[PDB]
Design a protein around this ligand. Structure first.
Ligand SMILES: O=S(=O)(O)CC(O)CNC1CCCCC1
Length: 213
């Protein structure tokens, strides 16, 4: 795997190798069982600690926006997420990692740190048109992994708002000293956040690490 980071700060966290948060998306062809194992093997080799982030319940929004009825969408997600979990558990066992350090971005709905970060992201979303547009686009890119209408995006964007706290301050939520969220797509919104373009800030102990094989 190769790596690319946003700022020079994301780079400094990278050199310490303390912790990596490996994103696994429920509906993205990237994540074959096989790829999950290779990805996880690499993480455990490269980092002192490895955790895994799966999609929360808002992933149901992506399917609903795409037309799936609510009840079915919720079950489809449960099926896909629990499947991602099973592969990641297996992979973590096999490489010495920790099968319990797998979380979904819904697992902290009642946690102070997570809720506070939701509030910050939400505030910015409603107050700042440029941040709201950025979020809509990021939600559009989530669907792509038929025309995508305005209203499909307002449904889908709940998904983006729910995950973003782990993109800006996962350490607050997970209780680790510092982290890199690791993923195979580039993070456009992350660049703008870097340049202080929004009321939402990237914590100095969070980085984004783009991986590629
Ligand atoms: O829009 S992107 O595809 O760049 C990013 C996105 O929306 C979701 N990516 C996953 C979701 C599940 C947990 C880890 C991150």
């Amino acid at each position: 795997f190769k790596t690319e980071t946003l700022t020079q700060n994301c780079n400094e966290i990278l050199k310490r190798r303390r912790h990596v948060l490996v994103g696994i998306s429920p509906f993205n062809s990237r994540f074959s069982e096989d790829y999950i194992h290779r990805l996880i093997a690499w993480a455990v080799r490269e980092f002192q600690s490895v955790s895994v982030l799966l999609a929360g319940k808002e992933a149901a929004n992506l399917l609903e926006a795409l037309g799936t009825p609510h009840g079915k969408a919720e079950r489809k997600v449960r099926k896909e997420v629990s499947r991602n979990r099973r592969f990641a558990e297996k992979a973590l066992e096999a490489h010495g990692g920790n099968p319990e350090d797998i979380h979904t971005f819904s697992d902290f709905a009642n946690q102070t740190a997570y809720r506070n970060l939701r509030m910050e992201v939400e505030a910015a979303f409603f107050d700042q048109t440029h941040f709201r547009n950025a979020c809509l686009e990021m939600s559009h890119a989530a669907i792509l992994g038929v025309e995508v209408s305005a209203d499909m995006l307002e449904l889908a964007v709940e998904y983006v708002i729910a995950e973003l706290p782990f993109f800006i301050a996962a350490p607050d939520i997970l209780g680790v000293e510092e982290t890199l969220l690791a993923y195979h797509r580039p993070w456009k919104l992350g660049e703008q956040i870097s340049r202080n373009e929004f009321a939402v800030k990237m914590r100095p102990n969070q980085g984004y690490l783009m991986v590629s094989e």
